[PDB]
Paper text:
The signals are triggered by lymphocyte surface receptors and further transduced by a multitude of effectors that converge on the CBM, which is a macromolecule complex that consists of caspase recruitment domain membrane-associated guanylate kinase protein 1 (CARMA1), B-cell lymphoma 10 (BCL10) and mucosa-associated lymphoid tissue lymphoma translocation gene 1 (MALT1). The CBM complex plays a specific and essential role in the activation of nuclear factor-κB (NF-κB) and c-Jun N-terminal kinase (JNK). As a scaffold molecule, CARMA1 recruits BCL10, MALT1, protein kinase C and TRAF6 to form a multiprotein complex. The CARD domain is located at the amino terminus of CARMA1 and is able to associate with BCL10, the key first step in CBM formation after stimulation.
The crystal structure of CARMA1-CARD was determined at a resolution of 1.75 Å using single-wavelength anomalous dispersion (SAD). There is one molecule per asymmetric unit. The structure of CARMA1-CARD contains residues 19–109. Each molecule contains six α-helices, and they are compactly arranged around a conserved hydrophobic core, which is the characteristic fold in the death domain superfamily. Helices H2 to H5 are arranged in an anti-parallel helix bundle, whereas H1 and H6 flank one side of the bundle and cover the top region of helices H4 and H5. Of the six helices, H1 is the longest and is slightly bent at residue N29, thereby separating the helix into two smaller α-helices, which is similar to the CARD domains from Apaf-1 and NOD1. The significant difference exists in the loop between helices H3 and H4, which is longer and more flexible in CARMA1-CARD. An area of clustered positive charges was found on the surface of CARMA1-CARD. The positive patch was formed by residues R35, K41, K69 and R72. In the crystal structure of CARMA1-CARD, this positive patch is stabilized by two sulfate ions through multiple hydrogen bonds.
Numbering used by the authors: 20 to 109
Write the structure that this text describes.
């Protein structure tokens, strides 16, 4: 609830700048989302606005407990270093 605050207060940058497809293979491999979660994220319409493109992914991760939080953070550390620093305040 408070741990997730780090993601939620940065949800705007995360929702725009994450390309979900880059993250899902690692998230799935770590078992924090499944094939169907990935489907929902990958099959979502490609809109003119990218502002909410990773919105669905975040909302799914929000339901995945501290494991989800920690694995998501490492996925940012791997793939989106500036976003990782944003979330962790470093």
């Amino acid at each position: 609830a408070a741990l997730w605050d780090n993601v939620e207060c940065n949800r705007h940058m995360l929702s725009r700048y994450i390309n979900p497809a880059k993250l899902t293979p690692y998230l799935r491999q770590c078992k924090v989302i499944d094939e169907q979660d990935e489907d929902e994220v990958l099959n979502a319409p490609m809109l003119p606005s990218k502002i909410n493109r990773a919105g669905r992914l975040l909302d799914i991760l929000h339901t995945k407990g501290q494991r989800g939080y920690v694995v998501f953070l490492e996925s940012l550390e791997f793939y989106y270093p500036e976003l990782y620093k944003l979330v962790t305040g470093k």
